[PDB]
Every structure is written in structure tokens, then in C-alpha cells.
Design a protein around this ligand. Structure first.
Ligand SMILES: [K+]
Ligand SMILES: [K+]
Ligand SMILES: [K+]
Ligand SMILES: [K+]
Ligand SMILES: [K+]
Ligand SMILES: [K+]
Ligand SMILES: [K+]
Ligand SMILES: [K+]
Ligand SMILES: [K+]
Ligand SMILES: [K+]
Ligand SMILES: [K+]
Ligand SMILES: [K+]
Ligand SMILES: [Mg+2]
Ligand SMILES: [Mg+2]
Ligand SMILES: [Mg+2]
Ligand SMILES: [Mg+2]
Ligand SMILES: [Mg+2]
Ligand SMILES: [Mg+2]
Ligand SMILES: [Mg+2]
Ligand SMILES: [Mg+2]
Ligand SMILES: [Mg+2]
Ligand SMILES: [Mg+2]
Ligand SMILES: [Mg+2]
Ligand SMILES: [Mg+2]
Ligand SMILES: [Mg+2]
Ligand SMILES: [Mg+2]
Ligand SMILES: [Mg+2]
Ligand SMILES: [Mg+2]
Ligand SMILES: [Mg+2]
Ligand SMILES: [Mg+2]
Ligand SMILES: [Mg+2]
Ligand SMILES: [Mg+2]
Ligand SMILES: [Mg+2]
Ligand SMILES: [Mg+2]
Ligand SMILES: [Mg+2]
Ligand SMILES: [Mg+2]
Ligand SMILES: [Mg+2]
Ligand SMILES: [Mg+2]
Ligand SMILES: [Mg+2]
Ligand SMILES: [Mg+2]
Ligand SMILES: [Mg+2]
Ligand SMILES: [Mg+2]
Ligand SMILES: [Mg+2]
Ligand SMILES: [Mg+2]
Ligand SMILES: [Mg+2]
Ligand SMILES: [Mg+2]
Ligand SMILES: [Mg+2]
Ligand SMILES: [Mg+2]
Ligand SMILES: [Mg+2]
Ligand SMILES: [Mg+2]
Ligand SMILES: [Mg+2]
Ligand SMILES: [Mg+2]
Ligand SMILES: [Mg+2]
Ligand SMILES: [Mg+2]
Ligand SMILES: [Mg+2]
Ligand SMILES: [Mg+2]
Ligand SMILES: [Mg+2]
Ligand SMILES: [Mg+2]
Ligand SMILES: [Mg+2]
Ligand SMILES: [Mg+2]
Ligand SMILES: [Mg+2]
Ligand SMILES: [Mg+2]
Ligand SMILES: [Mg+2]
Ligand SMILES: [Mg+2]
Ligand SMILES: [Mg+2]
Ligand SMILES: [Mg+2]
Ligand SMILES: [Mg+2]
Ligand SMILES: [Mg+2]
Ligand SMILES: [Mg+2]
Ligand SMILES: [Mg+2]
Ligand SMILES: [Mg+2]
Ligand SMILES: [Mg+2]
Ligand SMILES: [Mg+2]
Ligand SMILES: [Mg+2]
Ligand SMILES: [Mg+2]
Ligand SMILES: [Mg+2]
Ligand SMILES: [Mg+2]
Ligand SMILES: [Mg+2]
Ligand SMILES: [Mg+2]
Ligand SMILES: [Mg+2]
Ligand SMILES: [Mg+2]
Ligand SMILES: [Mg+2]
Ligand SMILES: [Mg+2]
Ligand SMILES: [Mg+2]
Ligand SMILES: [Mg+2]
Ligand SMILES: [Mg+2]
Ligand SMILES: [Mg+2]
Ligand SMILES: [Mg+2]
Ligand SMILES: [Mg+2]
Ligand SMILES: [Mg+2]
Ligand SMILES: [Mg+2]
Ligand SMILES: [Mg+2]
Ligand SMILES: [Mg+2]
Ligand SMILES: [Mg+2]
Ligand SMILES: [Mg+2]
Ligand SMILES: [Mg+2]
Ligand SMILES: [Mg+2]
Ligand SMILES: [Mg+2]
Ligand SMILES: [Mg+2]
Ligand SMILES: [Mg+2]
Ligand SMILES: [Mg+2]
Ligand SMILES: [Mg+2]
Ligand SMILES: [Mg+2]
Ligand SMILES: [Mg+2]
Ligand SMILES: [Mg+2]
Ligand SMILES: [Mg+2]
Ligand SMILES: [Mg+2]
Ligand SMILES: [Mg+2]
Ligand SMILES: [Mg+2]
Ligand SMILES: [Mg+2]
Ligand SMILES: [Mg+2]
Ligand SMILES: [Mg+2]
Ligand SMILES: [Mg+2]
Ligand SMILES: [Mg+2]
Ligand SMILES: [Mg+2]
Ligand SMILES: [Mg+2]
Ligand SMILES: [Mg+2]
Ligand SMILES: [Mg+2]
Ligand SMILES: [Mg+2]
Ligand SMILES: [Mg+2]
Ligand SMILES: [Mg+2]
Ligand SMILES: [Mg+2]
Ligand SMILES: [Mg+2]
Ligand SMILES: [Mg+2]
Ligand SMILES: [Mg+2]
Ligand SMILES: [Mg+2]
Ligand SMILES: [Mg+2]
Ligand SMILES: [Zn+2]
Lengths: 99, 83, 99, 208
RNA sequence: UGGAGAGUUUGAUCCUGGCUCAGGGUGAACGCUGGCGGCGUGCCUAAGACAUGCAAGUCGUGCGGGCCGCGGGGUUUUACUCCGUGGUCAGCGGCGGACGGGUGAGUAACGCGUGGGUGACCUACCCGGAAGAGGGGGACAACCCGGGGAAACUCGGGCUAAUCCCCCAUGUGGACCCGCCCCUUGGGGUGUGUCCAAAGGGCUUUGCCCGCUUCCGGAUGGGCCCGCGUCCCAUCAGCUAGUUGGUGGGGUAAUGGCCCACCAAGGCGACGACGGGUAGCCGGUCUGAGAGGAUGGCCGGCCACAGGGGCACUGAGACACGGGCCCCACUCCUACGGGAGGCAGCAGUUAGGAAUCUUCCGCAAUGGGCGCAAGCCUGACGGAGCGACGCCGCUUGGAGGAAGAAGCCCUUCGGGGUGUAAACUCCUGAACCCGGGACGAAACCCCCGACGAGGGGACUGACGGUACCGGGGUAAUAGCGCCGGCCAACUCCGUGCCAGCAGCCGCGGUAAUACGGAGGGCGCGAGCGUUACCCGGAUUCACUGGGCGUAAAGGGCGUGUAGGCGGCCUGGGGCGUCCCAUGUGAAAGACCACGGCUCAACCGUGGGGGAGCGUGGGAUACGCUCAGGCUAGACG
């Protein structure tokens, strides 16, 4: 079966493309704590249908381009900008630690 | 092509063969598709030759080609017997 | 002091000159046909596209222009010709293109 | 190697009368009957309180030198027993008693275990009919240990099986004296063996 | 069925704490010593350089010839020529050279492991099914002639065959554009239009065999894509210009920014990008109570590479180890113009290094390529050789033998020790000497049958006169370390902080169980020690399993970002969590049972397993999320 993930659209700045951040929980292999990792996937939106904040499902697809290997299956729930704000804050914190 | 042949598994001066289905290109002791029997040339035990008949019939139906020795061993096990 | 498998090498050279020839024809004819489709001459364009398709398939007979790469070339050729004729119209000779 | 050399010096060093010569360890000539102290210049001197390692090492050396088995085969048999299910000590003793040379000694074919080793090594012993010349051969319950028909006319076998008339054999062994053969009935229990050795000390010695 | 500790800081103690030792392991090496056999194993360094031989070919049942020879013909003879045949040589043509074999360089990466996707794909030979093969035409080698070059080799002209190339036809069918239907990414069907097939050979000769062509499917093998996992350094913090995306193209069997035009300004990063370093990865292996640590040699799977770098051709398949082209370094030939070569294939040479083998036998067995077959090729492989390198089996004798030879060492001078040890007595018979003497090998093939099933017959052994069996038959290698404590084993003499020992504590400066020798003893034994390295002890990087008042260790303090953590009640969801079924978890190894070499090592068979991940279903206590409510926390 083609893998199906669920994430948040955090970048609509590309043409016919979205950036879906997908989280996942798993116990640490040695320390057993349930830790939360995350990964961004470039998903294909051929109709510019999905916008920022939309929580969507993502399906493994025939490759559309380099780095782009997934399509947007459906919209789970409409825009919730809280997670997008969290991601943008986590990104903006990188400018504080340079030198 | 896919062939039915013998793989050597015994020690030195103690040959023990596995009647085995594998691609002809892979080495004779390499990863085979399925073990369909075993053969002991020195007849050390009362059961020195065993063959899965239905599996051999299947692999012959799909187009495997046994070696002359493999064909001899299969014929001795009644794989081709249609009486 | 070497082995006679150099014969193979010789053969390859011949086959090279055999393949490069056929392709060199096909491409050429293709261009020609496309030109006649851009300029509106429909009967001549299709009459040449027929020969181009014939050469493509005849090269597919051998090891020169073998499996469905030949269908790729035929598809692209016929698509481009039908598209360029739609800019002018009147598919006169009614050759490779279906009704 | 089999340690080959003086034997009753081990009768002395081990502190317990061993039977490595067969006879003459029963006669008042074992040198353990008349010299019970350990060998060497410092044998008669007052012994110091030995360490625990000393006790365990001496016990294991007693148990090993009783059978005349090298340290290699001894450690291998011990590890083999420890791998098996059951009490390590009793299984180890049953393995040691299952050796072909020890079975020959127990059946009275030889007066000593080393004489039994020489009898086996020279092909004078058959197992189930087939000649076997390996002292390390393991006897299974049900095997018939016999004397070679070509060797039954030798003087030593005549003497040994002429003295075995009326003598009893171990509970796990049977003996046909006229046919010069015997059977290994079962593995011997710890109660069946009269060995002056504490097996738990040897287990603790290899536990280190 | 699984877990041992000890020595050492002090005058003594407790604690903290490091160091060291007892264990196991090795592709080992070195010293002393060294008898046999079986099974394994053997360049870890210079991915340095290589003399020589072999290692990849095969088909006359695809085709025409050259050379040498024989036989029979057309002729009265000659000249000339026709046919058959033998040997040989290449050539054209087909298949194979992309497998097998080697190595660990490079790679931190979809390379590998694992689980999936391909509606985005290919697969020569093989298997099943449907259909077909009609006619014509052409060229290049071999060969003949001439030229150029020292050579490698090369250039031009002419003749010719084919399963070589081409044209037309036949359209079972397939390919493509467009339209419709089903299906849902490029899957399947249908219509018109267009385009596309073929090769013959052999006979036991008008009937079969090897083939050929188009298509569908199977099988096998692979390409590509995705989730998760995969070392150290943050004394590397910002990285990116084909960079991220789009449109349209080119390209491939196929998706793709793979490549290219034009357009948009994006993409990645403390959840560690980028950079540096190191390193093939895994099944496994070593160790460990386990968790874990270390490792990836032999064998098996995948990868990458073939003097260094780059590139295409041919082909089903290669960016091709023993194919091609160019640049670079090196070696060789050279008429100085120019050429030849590429052991990380087998063996061997040399260099480096502490260190790693025979320039061996064989096509008998297994496997592979070609061939209808006979058969040819195969340094794949099967064996032998060398090396205690490892594992296992075995021998150097067995029994009797003094209140106890001699010698040697102690000594209270009474004696004690080496010690039943020896000499000796009797017995067996390692070595060797003879005779027999293998299994591994029955198929391919031939005959009957029907070239099927079935039956029958025949050939073929490198190892090797080896294994093994029978007879005969000689008492016939023992060494190495240690003896102060950890740690099993004590005396004498010599030496005098000298000579030296030492893993740690430490010993020796006159009477040393510690140095050296002797006697004796302890431990192993064809081995014993040493060194190196790995795990162990080590709970000493503490998940299981540690700590921070004074022993190493709380940041000088606050505010607060990300993150981590979250009071009580009800409900929905079922992400974590849990359960059932199922798929996967190759083989070998590991575990258990039985069995084969006289045992064992080694090996065969069978059984049992198993974390993880995919799928279907279920559970909702807790963690999570959403919605509502409460006031004990918090704030006012
Ligand atoms: K920035
Ligand atoms: K102390
Ligand atoms: K020519
Ligand atoms: K049609
Ligand atoms: K397939
Ligand atoms: K090649
Ligand atoms: K005899
Ligand atoms: K037959
Ligand atoms: K004999
Ligand atoms: K001196
Ligand atoms: K000394
Ligand atoms: K754990
Ligand atoms: Mg999410
Ligand atoms: Mg957008
Ligand atoms: Mg695109
Ligand atoms: Mg293969
Ligand atoms: Mg049978
Ligand atoms: Mg059949
Ligand atoms: Mg060739
Ligand atoms: Mg050829
Ligand atoms: Mg042109
Ligand atoms: Mg091609
Ligand atoms: Mg046990
Ligand atoms: Mg146990
Ligand atoms: Mg300590
Ligand atoms: Mg102090
Ligand atoms: Mg002190
Ligand atoms: Mg004090
Ligand atoms: Mg060690
Ligand atoms: Mg060790
Ligand atoms: Mg020597
Ligand atoms: Mg050997
Ligand atoms: Mg070898
Ligand atoms: Mg190494
Ligand atoms: Mg190397
Ligand atoms: Mg003539
Ligand atoms: Mg006439
Ligand atoms: Mg004349
Ligand atoms: Mg000829
Ligand atoms: Mg030829
Ligand atoms: Mg030529
Ligand atoms: Mg290979
Ligand atoms: Mg790096
Ligand atoms: Mg990196
Ligand atoms: Mg993967
Ligand atoms: Mg990855
Ligand atoms: Mg995979
Ligand atoms: Mg074909
Ligand atoms: Mg074909
Ligand atoms: Mg077919
Ligand atoms: Mg012709
Ligand atoms: Mg012609
Ligand atoms: Mg012609
Ligand atoms: Mg010409
Ligand atoms: Mg001519
Ligand atoms: Mg053809
Ligand atoms: Mg049709
Ligand atoms: Mg046609
Ligand atoms: Mg023709
Ligand atoms: Mg005919
Ligand atoms: Mg043929
Ligand atoms: Mg696949
Ligand atoms: Mg790129
Ligand atoms: Mg594109
Ligand atoms: Mg290609
Ligand atoms: Mg980047
Ligand atoms: Mg991340
Ligand atoms: Mg490296
Ligand atoms: Mg273990
Ligand atoms: Mg283990
Ligand atoms: Mg482990
Ligand atoms: Mg590793
Ligand atoms: Mg390897
Ligand atoms: Mg390997
Ligand atoms: Mg080299
Ligand atoms: Mg290169
Ligand atoms: Mg090169
Ligand atoms: Mg081919
Ligand atoms: Mg390559
Ligand atoms: Mg190449
Ligand atoms: Mg080579
Ligand atoms: Mg060349
Ligand atoms: Mg040297
Ligand atoms: Mg070798
Ligand atoms: Mg040879
Ligand atoms: Mg062969
Ligand atoms: Mg063969
Ligand atoms: Mg070999
Ligand atoms: Mg040994
Ligand atoms: Mg004696
Ligand atoms: Mg005699
Ligand atoms: Mg036979
Ligand atoms: Mg016939
Ligand atoms: Mg037959
Ligand atoms: Mg043959
Ligand atoms: Mg012979
Ligand atoms: Mg004999
Ligand atoms: Mg002591
Ligand atoms: Mg010393
Ligand atoms: Mg040390
Ligand atoms: Mg003095
Ligand atoms: Mg002194
Ligand atoms: Mg001393
Ligand atoms: Mg001594
Ligand atoms: Mg050693
Ligand atoms: Mg250590
Ligand atoms: Mg630890
Ligand atoms: Mg522990
Ligand atoms: Mg440490
Ligand atoms: Mg902890
Ligand atoms: Mg602590
Ligand atoms: Mg402090
Ligand atoms: Mg403070
Ligand atoms: Mg937060
Ligand atoms: Mg917060
Ligand atoms: Mg709660
Ligand atoms: Mg929370
Ligand atoms: Mg609930
Ligand atoms: Mg769930
Ligand atoms: Mg397994
Ligand atoms: Mg098994
Ligand atoms: Mg057995
Ligand atoms: Mg299971
Ligand atoms: Mg489920
Ligand atoms: Mg519920
Ligand atoms: Mg609330
Ligand atoms: Mg208040
Ligand atoms: Zn005694």
C-alpha cells in the first residue's frame, strides 16, 4: 500500500506545490521515552486548492520532480494557523544564534 | 533461464547436494529460489534422496530446466512417471 | 597477443554505422514533416509523416530503434503534426491521423 | 599427553588414596599406605590453611586425575554438561562414566583406567560388534561392549576375566564373563558412584 | 537455566576514585620447543610495481573460400574443368564475452538493512497459448590486384555467399493520433485512419527435428520511487544558482530539475543543514546474566571499483576487469615519425611489513558457455602441497617392581627428598613391512518403446594403490611457564640499591621463598609463554544501572523563546499503548532431536523458533487530540 501521512500546510509560496509538515511519535530505542519527531514533505497541489494552515492527508505518488514525491489526498480539517505559527517561531529562533 | 540443479553443501570428501531451483546465472552455492529436495551420492543413510514431487511438477510447468544429473535424480523419484 | 573477440568490436562498428544512419534519416524526415505542418501544407506534411512513421517502425524491427521508444517518437510526431495543422486546418490527405 | 609419568605421587598429593595402578593401590605398596604426606622436600612440613581457590582447584584436580583425562577434554565435557538441561554435576559424572575407557575399566576388562586406555587404543575392544579404538568414545545406553575375538586368547584378558569370576559390577552395567562382553544399561546416578569428590566444588571452580 | 572478585592512597579506618590482575576471543605475530592424522584456514601493510604460463569461448546442422593432400568424372593425349573427401587456416554470421572470479579504493549516500509502491517500467535464453512465413532485390569480408609504414598495422580498386542488409505483399495481431465506454495518474476495451512481420538448415526426406516472425501470459532477473534505521566532531552555524517550483520541450525501457529554454523566489537548517573526519553495508561473529559494547575476516546477500580521470559504441542487458576512444603518470619497442601494455583472475616475482602458501594435479564429480548431438572451453570448481594459524582426535607404553640402588639436593648428621620413579620381569604392538583395495558414477549417449513414460545396455576416478580391511611387527619425541601477595607451588648457594626482576603493590645496600643458578614443587602439555587488539570484570558514560554540602561535579542572579512536563469530571476520535489473525523475517550460522565419517572436530536431515515492519479486525484504562464543565493550582 502507498504510504499515507497527515500534516499541516506551512508554505504555499510555490506554484502547484505545498509544504506539508508531518509529525510522528515513537518510543526512544534505548531510553523508552515517547519522543516526537517531524519531517516536511513537498506535496503536489495541481489546482492550488489548499492554503496555509490546512491539515491534509498525503499519499505516496509517482515522482513529480526532485524532492517532490507526494500528492495531497484530501483535506482533513481547515486552516488552523497555530501549528504554522509554532513552525514559524521555531524557524525564526534560528536567527538569534549566529555569532 | 531458471534451472533445477544441485548445490554442494557437504564438507570435503563428504559431498551432500541440495536439489534446488535457481537462476542459472547465480553461483551454484548462492541464493536459490527454493529447495525442492536433497541427494546424498554416497548412500550413507537409508534416505539418501528425497524430492518434493508436486513442487518439481510446478517448476517444470512454469519452465525450469533441470540438469542431466538433476533430471536423472527427478526421474528416479518418479517426477515424470505418468503410468 | 590478444584474443579474437576483437571480431565483436569490428561488428559493433558496422552496426554503429547501421544505426546512426537510420536514426539520422528519421529525425530529418520528422523535422521536414513538422515544417510542412507549421506552414499549413497539410497533404505534403501527412504524406511525409506516413514515411516517417514507416521508417520508425522499420527501425524498431531491428536493434536500432527498438521497444516502445519507437512508440514515443511516433506519438510525439503525430501529436505535433495534428497540433500544428489545427493552427491552419484542412487535413487534406487523411493519412496517419485518425478522423 | 595424558600426563604420562608417576601416578601414586598423585595418590599422595591429592591426600586421598587413588587407584591409578589398579592393583598395588590395594596392596600395602601404594606408598599412600606408608607415606600419606604430599610429595616433595616440603611434604612433611606443616601445611598452611589453604585458600578457597586452593580447595576448589585441588578437588577438580582430584576428579580429573581420577579418570586420566586432559584439561582440554575435561573443560569441554564440563561446558557440554552445563549447556544441557539438568543438574550439571550428575550429568557431568554420567558423561565421564560414559567414556569407553572408563566403561572398560568398570566392566573389569582392565585393572586400571590407563590399562583400559591401552586396550582400547590397540583395537582389543569392540562396541556392538565393530572394533573401536577411541578412549573418548561415548557409550550409549544399550551398547554391548565386547572383547575382540582375536584378543580373547591373550594372557592379560585371561587373567583379568579369570579374576572377575564372582565379582559384582555396577548397577548400571551387566557382564557376561564366558562370552567376554557386557552391556551399558543406563547412565549412572550420583548415588551409584563412590567417588571421593565434591562435584559442587568443581562447578564453583569453573564458575570463576 | 542466569550475575564471584582481588591487589593498591593510611600508623590504622570508612568513603570516593583511578590503575592493575584473574576470563573469553583473534585472518595473528614473536621466543623456546615440536611426533601423526582429519576438518578448517592463510598479504590485516603499498587499491605499490609486475617477468612467465594458464585463466573465454563455441557452433561445418547459418555461409562462401584460401592452403596442403587424396579419389572419381567431361578428353585419345594435353590444356582446362566438374563432383566427392581429409586436414588445416582465418573470414562473414549467431550465441556467449554484462555470468562466473578478484578486491574495500571510493562512498555517511535510497549505498545498505527493512517494509512497501510502479496507474512510471524492461527482461536474451526458458515455459503455455493464437497465428504466419509469399515474391524480389542489394552490399561488405574471406579472396584477387596495387600502394604506404621500421613496426603496430593501414589505404585504394575488383569478385562473391548466407539464418548479412533492404523493398513489396499477406494483418492472426500489435504500435500511434483522435473519439466513446469501463477503470482511475500512462490500467483495460472499441471504431475509423495510418504504420509494422519473417530465414532458413538438417535429416532416419514429402514427415519430423533445430530454428524464424507477430502477439498475449507465466516464470526468472533487474531499473526507478517512498516510510523508518545506520559512526565521531557544534573548536563546522548558517547552506543553496540547476539552487526550489512551474510551463513546454529534449532524453530513457520508465517517473524525475536527468538535461535544456522561458517564468515564478523559492528550497534546507539546533528534530544538527552545510563542512571536516572516519568507514563498504548486512545475514552474522566475539563478548556479555541481560541490556549493551566491539567487529563485518572465512561463507551467503546487496554495493562500488578494475593504473588515475572522462566518454560513448555494440547489445535484452555494460559506461563492459582479461572490449573501444581521449587526457595524465609509469614501463617496454622505436628507423625518433610513431606504437604496445594495465594480476584488486590462478600460481609466482619484487617492494613494503612483525607477518600470510604451490610458477601443483584434474574434466572424474557439481555448476557454467556454445552445440541436434558427438564434443570443445572452464586457475568456477573438485583435490593435493606448504604453515602447530585454529578446532578436534591420537601417541611417546601397560602391569608387577625395596622401609627405598646410584647420582643429585637438603640435614638437628639420627635422617629426609627426587620415588615405583628407574634399572629390571612379563605383556600389548605407535611407527613401519607386505597383500587386497574402494564409495564418490549414472546419467548425457545407444537400443526397444513413440527421440514421451517406462525398460535395458555401454563408457567415464584427479584425489589414488589414498581411505579402509587382513597378516607381520619394534617400548618407541617432551616440552614451556610459574613458585612474595593478588595466585596453586620452598629450600640451598651465589650476589650485596651491584648484576638484575616487575601486569599492579613492590624486591636487592650480608645471611633475598621476589635477582641469578641448583634441588624440589605447581600449572598446562605438542604445545607453553610473550606482545598487540576486542569484550569482560567496569554499577568506571550507570536504559536496565551512578552521581553533584565538605571526595571530580549546581550555572553569579534573573526575565523568558523553543522544547520537555500537565489538577478534577463527562463525551467523541483511536495517534501513542494493548490484543487476535495473516504476510514478511532467504540459506548458512545459533538452539533441540536423530543420523553419516570407528569418536570428535566436520557434515546431513528434521523440528523449534524469533524482535521489527505491512495488512485486516478489535479493546479505550492510561498518554494524545477535539468539545463541554468544575475550582483545590495559578492570577486578579
Ligand atoms: K536566514
Ligand atoms: K589494607
Ligand atoms: K580492402
Ligand atoms: K485497424
Ligand atoms: K513479471
Ligand atoms: K567486458
Ligand atoms: K597381532
Ligand atoms: K529413457
Ligand atoms: K594389526
Ligand atoms: K656483579
Ligand atoms: K629465583
Ligand atoms: K532496554
Ligand atoms: Mg501533525
Ligand atoms: Mg501555492
Ligand atoms: Mg513538474
Ligand atoms: Mg544474478
Ligand atoms: Mg528412494
Ligand atoms: Mg511429468
Ligand atoms: Mg571472439
Ligand atoms: Mg564469434
Ligand atoms: Mg540532416
Ligand atoms: Mg540500444
Ligand atoms: Mg547443566
Ligand atoms: Mg545451563
Ligand atoms: Mg578499586
Ligand atoms: Mg592522603
Ligand atoms: Mg604505608
Ligand atoms: Mg591520619
Ligand atoms: Mg587477555
Ligand atoms: Mg587471554
Ligand atoms: Mg625450529
Ligand atoms: Mg590440511
Ligand atoms: Mg588451502
Ligand atoms: Mg583485520
Ligand atoms: Mg589489500
Ligand atoms: Mg584429380
Ligand atoms: Mg566420346
Ligand atoms: Mg599433348
Ligand atoms: Mg576447407
Ligand atoms: Mg572457423
Ligand atoms: Mg580481418
Ligand atoms: Mg561477481
Ligand atoms: Mg563527510
Ligand atoms: Mg555530514
Ligand atoms: Mg529502502
Ligand atoms: Mg536515509
Ligand atoms: Mg527493498
Ligand atoms: Mg529472439
Ligand atoms: Mg527476438
Ligand atoms: Mg513460445
Ligand atoms: Mg541474392
Ligand atoms: Mg546478388
Ligand atoms: Mg550481387
Ligand atoms: Mg570495394
Ligand atoms: Mg577475383
Ligand atoms: Mg534477420
Ligand atoms: Mg485487427
Ligand atoms: Mg508491409
Ligand atoms: Mg527474403
Ligand atoms: Mg521434402
Ligand atoms: Mg542450428
Ligand atoms: Mg520487483
Ligand atoms: Mg540537479
Ligand atoms: Mg518537465
Ligand atoms: Mg539503454
Ligand atoms: Mg541543500
Ligand atoms: Mg527532522
Ligand atoms: Mg575508506
Ligand atoms: Mg552466551
Ligand atoms: Mg551468545
Ligand atoms: Mg548481542
Ligand atoms: Mg558496524
Ligand atoms: Mg566480503
Ligand atoms: Mg562476503
Ligand atoms: Mg595494482
Ligand atoms: Mg579507469
Ligand atoms: Mg583508464
Ligand atoms: Mg545479445
Ligand atoms: Mg562498471
Ligand atoms: Mg572499459
Ligand atoms: Mg588482467
Ligand atoms: Mg589498443
Ligand atoms: Mg623485507
Ligand atoms: Mg592455498
Ligand atoms: Mg592441468
Ligand atoms: Mg567438468
Ligand atoms: Mg557438466
Ligand atoms: Mg579450491
Ligand atoms: Mg590436541
Ligand atoms: Mg611404571
Ligand atoms: Mg611381541
Ligand atoms: Mg555405483
Ligand atoms: Mg528410435
Ligand atoms: Mg533410463
Ligand atoms: Mg562426459
Ligand atoms: Mg587410480
Ligand atoms: Mg594393521
Ligand atoms: Mg600461595
Ligand atoms: Mg622471573
Ligand atoms: Mg600487560
Ligand atoms: Mg654471601
Ligand atoms: Mg643467600
Ligand atoms: Mg628464589
Ligand atoms: Mg626443575
Ligand atoms: Mg598462544
Ligand atoms: Mg580491559
Ligand atoms: Mg558497562
Ligand atoms: Mg554488569
Ligand atoms: Mg574510564
Ligand atoms: Mg540512570
Ligand atoms: Mg559516582
Ligand atoms: Mg566540590
Ligand atoms: Mg547558587
Ligand atoms: Mg510549547
Ligand atoms: Mg512554553
Ligand atoms: Mg491528565
Ligand atoms: Mg501537551
Ligand atoms: Mg473517553
Ligand atoms: Mg490505534
Ligand atoms: Mg534461519
Ligand atoms: Mg539447520
Ligand atoms: Mg555418531
Ligand atoms: Mg512468531
Ligand atoms: Mg491495526
Ligand atoms: Mg470505544
Ligand atoms: Mg477547558
Ligand atoms: Mg489572592
Ligand atoms: Zn596409589
Amino acid at each position: 500500500p502507498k504510504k499515507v501521512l497527515t500534516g499541516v500546510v506551512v508554505s504555499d509560496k510555490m506554484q502547484k506545490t505545498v509544504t506539508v509538515l508531518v509529525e510522528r511519535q515513537f518510543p526512544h530505542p534505548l531510553y523508552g521515552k515517547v519522543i516526537k519527531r517531524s519531517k516536511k514533505y513537498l506535496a503536489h497541489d495541481p489546482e492550488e486548492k489548499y492554503k496555509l494552515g490546512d491539515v491534509v492527508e498525503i499519499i505516496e505518488s509517482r515522482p513529480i520532480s526532485k524532492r517532490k514525491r507526494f500528492r495531497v489526498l484530501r483535506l482533513v480539517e481547515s486552516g488552523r494557523m497555530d501549528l504554522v505559527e509554532k513552525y514559524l517561531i521555531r524557524r525564526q529562533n534560528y536567527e538569534s544564534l549566529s555569532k | 533461464m531458471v534451472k533445477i540443479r544441485l548445490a554442494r553443501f557437504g564438507s570435503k570428501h563428504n559431498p551432500h547436494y541440495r536439489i534446488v531451483v535457481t537462476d542459472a546465472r547465480r553461483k551454484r552455492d548462492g541464493k536459490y529460489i527454493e529447495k525442492i529436495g536433497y541427494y546424498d551420492p554416497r548412500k550413507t543413510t537409508p534416505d539418501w534422496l528425497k524430492v518434493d514431487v508436486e513442487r518439481a511438477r510446478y517448476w517444470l510447468s512454469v519452465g525450469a530446466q533441470p540438469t542431466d544429473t538433476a533430471r536423472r535424480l527427478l526421474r528416479q523419484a518418479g517426477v515424470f512417471r505418468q503410468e | 597477443r590478444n584474443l579474437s573477440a576483437l571480431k565483436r568490436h569490428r561488428q559493433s562498428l558496422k552496426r554503429r554505422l547501421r544505426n546512426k544512419a537510420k536514426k539520422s534519416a528519421i529525425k530529418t524526415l520528422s523535422k521536414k514533416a513538422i515544417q510542412l505542418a507549421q506552414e499549413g501544407k497539410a497533404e505534403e506534411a501527412l504524406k511525409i509523416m506516413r514515411k516517417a512513421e514507416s521508417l520508425i517502425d522499420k527501425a524498431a524491427k531491428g536493434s536500432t530503434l527498438h521497444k516502445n521508444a519507437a512508440a514515443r517518437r511516433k506519438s510525439r510526431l503525430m501529436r505535433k503534426v495534428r497540433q500544428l495543422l489545427e493552427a491552419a486546418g484542412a487535413p487534406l490527405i487523411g493519412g496517419g491521423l485518425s478522423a | 599427553g595424558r600426563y604420562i609419568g608417576p601416578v601414586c605421587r598423585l595418590c599422595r598429593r591429592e591426600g586421598v588414596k587413588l587407584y591409578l595402578k589398579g592393583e598395588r593401590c590395594y596392596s600395602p605398596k601404594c606408598a599412600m599406605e606408608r607415606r600419606p604426606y604430599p610429595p616433595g622436600q616440603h611434604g612433611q612440613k606443616r601445611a598452611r590453611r589453604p585458600s578457597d581457590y586452593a580447595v576448589r582447584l585441588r578437588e577438580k584436580q582430584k576428579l580429573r586425575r581420577i579418570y586420566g583425562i586432559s584439561e582440554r577434554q575435561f573443560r569441554n565435557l564440563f561446558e557440554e554438561a552445563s549447556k544441557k538441561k539438568g543438574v550439571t554435576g550428575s550429568v557431568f559424572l554420567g558423561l565421564l562414566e560414559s567414556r569407553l575407557d572408563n566403561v572398560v575399566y568398570r566392566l573389569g576388562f582392565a585393572v586400571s583406567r590407563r590399562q583400559a586406555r591401552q586396550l582400547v587404543r590397540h583395537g582389543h575392544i569392540t562396541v556392538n560388534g565393530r572394533r573401536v579404538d577411541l578412549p573418548s568414545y561415548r557409550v550409549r545406553p544399550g551398547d554391548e561392549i565386547a572383547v575382540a575375538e582375536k584378543s580373547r586368547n591373550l594372557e592379560l584378558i585371561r587373567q583379568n576375566l579369570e579374576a572377575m569370576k564372582g565379582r559384582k559390577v555396577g548397577p548400571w552395567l551387566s557382564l557376561d564373563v564366558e562370552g567376554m562382553k557386557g552391556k551399558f544399561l543406563r547412565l549412572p546416578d550420583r548415588e551409584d558412584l563412590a567417588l571421593p569428590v565434591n562435584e559442587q566444588l568443581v562447578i564453583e571452580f569453573y564458575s570463576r
